[PDB]
Design a protein around this ligand. Structure first.
Ligand SMILES: OC[C@H]1O[C@H](O)[C@H](O)[C@@H](O)[C@H]1O
Length: 350
C-alpha cells in the first residue's frame, strides 16, 4: 500500500493568460486529495467525497460521464504514451473541496498518475507528469484548459509561488512573504455552469493570435490591438495588461513589497470584472469587502463565473476577516460559501 498527497492550487496573478502562452504565477496549497492504494487486476476506487465505489476493467477506458472518467483518462494517456501499467485498488479522500475552483480535477488526476508512477515504478519526470495529466483532461475528459493547474500541483514548493512562462515552460520559484495569509473564499457558486464561457474566451483569444500572426500574447503590445475586431480587442486588451501585471508582481514579491503586490491583484480583479467580463456579483462582493476590512489586495482566482476568490491579508487578521465577510455574505446570497486559510505548499508526493 502507498499513500499519495496531491495538493490543489491557487493562481496569484496571471489569469486567462495560459491559453495564449502568457505568464502565470500559481502556488500549490495545503488542501489535498489523498489516495491510498495497492496493485490490483482491475481499477477499484472508493471516493469519500461521493460515498461510493466505482470500478472498471483495464480493458474498459470508455467514458462513463462520472468522476471515474478522471481516473480512466490517466490510464488512457499512459496507454497512448506507450506505458504498461496494471490496475489499482484504493481509497480517495482528503480536504480539498470539490468544484470550488481550487483544481480538484488537476489534484485528482495528478494524484492518480503519481500513484501509478510509484506502484509501477514508471520513474516519470515532473514535466512529463504535468503534460500527461493535461493531455488526459483535454483529450479524454474533454475539458479545455491550459497548463496552469497541472503545473502548480506538480511543481509547487513550500513557501514559494511559481513564476511560469507557459510558452517556453521556463519557471522560477519566488518566496511568498512571512505572516501574509492567503484567505480563500468559495462563493458556493459552482463555476462549471459557465464552461461554455471559458471555451468562448479561449477560442476568441486563439483567433486573435492568428489575426496578429503571433504565437504568444507575450509578443503582443497594446498598440497592435487596433488590428483586432472590437470584441477580440476588448478581451485581448485584458490579456496584454495581465501579462504585464505578472512581471510587476514578480518584481514586487522579490522585493518583499506586499503592499504593491496587493494593489496589482486588485487592479487585475477589476480588469477581469469589467473588461474580460468573467466575474460575478458574489466574487465582486468578496473583493470589495476584503479591501474595506484591510486586505492588501483581492482577486478572483481561476476561471471566474463563480468558484473562489483570494485575499492577501496579515496572518493574525485572516480568521477575523474571513468570518466577518462570510457572515455578511450569507445574509446576501443563498449559497453554501466557505472560507479557508491556505499557504504555499509542496507539489504532489508521498
Ligand atoms: O487563468 C484561467 C484558468 O482557468 C482554469 O482554471 C484553467 O484550468 C486554467 O488552465 C486557466 O486557464
Amino acid at each position: 500500500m502507498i499513500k499519495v498527497k496531491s495538493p490543489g492550487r491557487v493562481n496569484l496573478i496571471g489569469e486567462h493568460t495560459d491559453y495564449t502562452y502568457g505568464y502565470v504565477m500559481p502556488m500549490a496549497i495545503n488542501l489535498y486529495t489523498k489516495i491510498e492504494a495497492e496493485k490490483h487486476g482491475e481499477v477499484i476506487l472508493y471516493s469519500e467525497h461521493f460515498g461510493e465505489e466505482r470500478k472498471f476493467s483495464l480493458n474498459d477506458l470508455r467514458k462513463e460521464n462520472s468522476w471515474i472518467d478522471y481516473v480512466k483518462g490517466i490510464f488512457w494517456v499512459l496507454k497512448e504514451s506507450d506505458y504498461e501499467v496494471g490496475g489499482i485498488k484504493g481509497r480517495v479522500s482528503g480536504n480539498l473541496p470539490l468544484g470550488a475552483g481550487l483544481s480538484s480535477s488537476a489534484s485528482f488526476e495528478v494524484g492518480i498518475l503519481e500513484t501509478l508512477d510509484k506502484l509501477y515504478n514508471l520513474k516519470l519526470d515532473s514535466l512529463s507528469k504535468v503534460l500527461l495529466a493535461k493531455k488526459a483532461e483535454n483529450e479524454f475528459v474533454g475539458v479545455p484548459c491550459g497548463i496552469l493547474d497541472q503545473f502548480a500541483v506538480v511543481f509547487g514548493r513550500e513557501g514559494n509561488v511559481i513564476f511560469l512562462d507557459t510558452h517556453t515552460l521556463d519557471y522560477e520559484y519566488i518566496p511568498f512573504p512571512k505572516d501574509v495569509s492567503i484567505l480563500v473564499f468559495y462563493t458556493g457558486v459552482r463555476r462549471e455552469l459557465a464552461s461554455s464561457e471559458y471555451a468562448e474566451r479561449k477560442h476568441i483569444a486563439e483567433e486573435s493570435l492568428k489575426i496578429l500572426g503571433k504565437g504568444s500574447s507575450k509578443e503582443v503590445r497594446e498598440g497592435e490591438l487596433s488590428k483586432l475586431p472590437p470584441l477580440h480587442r476588448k478581451f485581448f486588451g485584458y490579456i496584454v495588461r495581465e501579462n504585464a501585471r505578472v512581471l510587476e508582481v514578480r518584481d514586487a514579491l522579490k522585493e518583499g513589497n506586499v503592499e504593491e503586490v496587493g494593489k496589482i491583484l486588485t487592479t487585475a480583479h477589476w480588469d477581469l470584472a469589467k473588461n474580460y467580463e468573467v466575474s460575478c456579483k458574489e466574487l465582486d462582493f468578496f473583493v470589495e469587502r476584503a479591501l474595506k476590512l484591510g486586505a492588501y489586495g483581492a482577486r478572483l482566482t481561476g476561471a471566474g463565473f463563480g468558484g473562489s476568490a483570494i485575499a492577501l491579508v496579515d496572518k493574525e487578521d485572516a480568521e477575523t476577516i474571513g468570518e466577518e465577510i462570510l457572515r455578511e455574505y450569507l445574509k446576501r446570497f443563498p449559497w453554501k460559501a466557505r472560507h479557508f486559510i491556505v499557504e504555499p505548499s509542496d507539489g504532489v508526493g508521498i
